[PDB]
Amino acid sequence: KETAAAKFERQHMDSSTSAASSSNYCNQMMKSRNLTKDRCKPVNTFVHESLADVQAVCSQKNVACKNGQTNCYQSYSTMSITDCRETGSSKYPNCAYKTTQANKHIIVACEGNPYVPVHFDASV
């Protein structure tokens, strides 16, 4: 089955570009990463940094997770991210998203050995 670490790379890593490729980015990426298979996932964030740079966040600023667990980490630097947000017009199976580019600190939950990101918690 899919590891949590692999699921995080699928759902949240896009190192291939430095920014939100275009107004079409989220429509294409939400589909191609399989986040519209069984329903339109309402919101999703993609990080445009290297895998190494996002994995390194697991050794950065320890912060509380939104669910109250203690294993979340905030990046010391801002990172290039794209927020995908489903539209009102959006009806499964034709999921439609607003693509928003920003530079924000990310917060990820990390687990395992090796200790790696398994959940995208927030951007700040």
8 A C-beta contact, residue 47 and residue 19: no
- Render the burial of 75-96: b for 16+ CB within 10 Å, e for the rest: beeebbbbbbebeeebeeeebe
User: What experiment produced this structure?
Assistant: X-ray
66 is in an annotated binding site: yes
Domain extents in the chain: 2-124
d(CA 80, CA 41): 21
42 is in an annotated binding site: yes
Residue type, 98: K
For the record, the structure tokens of 13 come out as 């890593």
| Helix then strand then coil, % of the chain, to nearest 5 | 20, 35, 45
* C-alpha 26 chain-centroid distance: 12
d(CA 2, CA 87): 29
Q: Catalytic residues, which ones?
A: 12, 119
Per CATH, the number for 2-124 is: 3.10.130.10
39 is in an annotated binding site: no
